[PDB]
Ligand binder design. Structure first.
Ligand SMILES: *[C@@H]1O[C@H](CO[C@@H]2O[C@@H](C)[C@@H](O)[C@@H](O)[C@@H]2O)[C@@H](O[C@@H]2O[C@H](CO)[C@@H](O)[C@H](O)[C@H]2NC(C)=O)[C@H](O)[C@H]1NC(C)=O
Ligand SMILES: *[C@@H]1O[C@H](CO)[C@@H](O)[C@H](O)[C@H]1NC(C)=O
Lengths: 237, 237
């Protein structure tokens, strides 16, 4: 039936529409999905944290259990798929987040109010690949990288601000102001999240398990990944 | 090379000992390694987060920037390769960690004291596999996961507490309290770390290739992984 969501396999899809139309929904949220573009980072985080409703013979994580990524959580998303500017956990604990969903203010109680969703317009991606004889020249790197950020992540070439290379560290700087973003353009935060997941081996694409990055045909593997976010307003700590 | 470190490729090994003995050392720490058994998660983190700190062609994050670290950092390890109970970053931020290195207290200053290394005695590995037409035989899947932990990660069978399956979710439940671990046992936290690295396409082995999971010969592809750690003393947030 080929009923699939190529740009998001973290979904459920079934040919049960009128005429058998393939209908799909975001796992963990029941939100709608565009199977021909990037799904917003907030819905993807909800999908990753989704619990089955009936555990059956599965067990559930203890309330006191912890996870490696201490910034990882199940988020609340608005109808357009953006993070709600105020996020909460443990019933009362509450804080504000930016457009990428990173805590930006001191934590408080339910009385906290976040004026707006501060937009992250600048993203630094620092990759440390394992040493290899292929010191692919910067030119060939920018070429496949911008190609990927345009043809895989569907981000527009101006929003790729710059790429750097000093072995064994590759660096991609992304810039997208609200003034430069036409509606229906892919946001840099979503393409950056798809990139982070492709690097770390949990690709969100259909049939792809990770980033099969090949410059001039030689595979390149990344050891360490560090991503920094710069938004319109400085964090208020 | 005859001189390799099969259980840990995050090493440099040279045939420069007496007579040509393969002498190996861990990247990022200089520590000795046992290439017949799994290396400590603390030392492997030191190998993964070693920082060149070069800025000739590279740019540094803005002072106001926030970071998605995945909770990763370069940690302090004791002579036995265990995490030191106390961990610091940015020189002044400091906290306690458990035996798997996860933060189990609120961040403090350089005055913070951690009494002991709290044992992580329970681990839950929740995999979500890429859907297939039919479910795997629960007995065959259970047997393959058990021999995987017995042979590849060299974990004793008694430390695998349970294996759950409810398509498409697989769950592996490891248990190893302080009283149940004799010296020379592989630790469940290390077996879990090697498993997670294998699944994400970053196998730690030097000559076993990679993880190609096969139940009854059918490929098993993990789309999502999540790991939960439970300590013998509840976290003090
Ligand atoms: C999963 O497989 C096991 C292993 O049996 C194999 O697969 C069977 C389909 C068949 O081809 C056997 O010859 C293979 O050895 C299944 O265990 C068997 O169960 C059958 C049916 O009840 C029983 O007659 C046999 O004694 C078992 N086979 C042996 C030799 O262990 C199991 O039932 C399969 N589960 C599912 C979900 O189908
Ligand atoms: C980079 O190196 C490759 C090696 O195959 C070569 O083909 C290419 O022309 C080089 N380009 C530059 C700009 O150095």
């Amino acid at each position: 039936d080929n009923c699939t969501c190529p740009t998001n396999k973290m979904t459920v899809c079934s040919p049960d529409g009128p005429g058998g139309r393939c209908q799909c929904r975001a796992l963990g949220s029941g939100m709608a999905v565009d199977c021909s573009t990037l799904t917003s980072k907030c819905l993807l985080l909800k999908a990753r944290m989704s619990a089955p409703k009936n555990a059956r013979t599965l067990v559930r994580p203890s309330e006191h259990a912890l996870v490696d990524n201490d910034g990882l959580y199940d988020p609340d998303c608005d109808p357009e798929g953006r993070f709600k500017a105020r996020q909460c956990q443990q019933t009362s604990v509450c804080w504000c987040v930016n457009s990428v969903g990173v805590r930006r203010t001191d934590k408080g109680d339910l009385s906290l109010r976040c004026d707006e969703l501060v937009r992250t317009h600048h993203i630094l991606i620092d990759l440390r690949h394992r040493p290899t004889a292929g010191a692919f020249n910067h030119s060939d790197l920018d070429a496949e990288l911008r190609r990927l950020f345009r043809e895989r992540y569907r981000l527009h070439p101006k929003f790729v601000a710059a790429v750097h290379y000093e072995q064994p560290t590759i660096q991609i700087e992304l810039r997208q102001q609200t003034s430069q973003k036409a509606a229906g353009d892919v946001d840099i935060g979503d393409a950056a999240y798809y990139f982070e997941r492709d690097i770390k081996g949990e690709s969100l694409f259909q049939g792809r398990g990770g980033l099969d990055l090949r410059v001039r045909g030689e595979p390149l593997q990344v050891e360490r990944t560090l991503i920094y976010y710069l938004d319109e307003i400085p964090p208020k700590f």
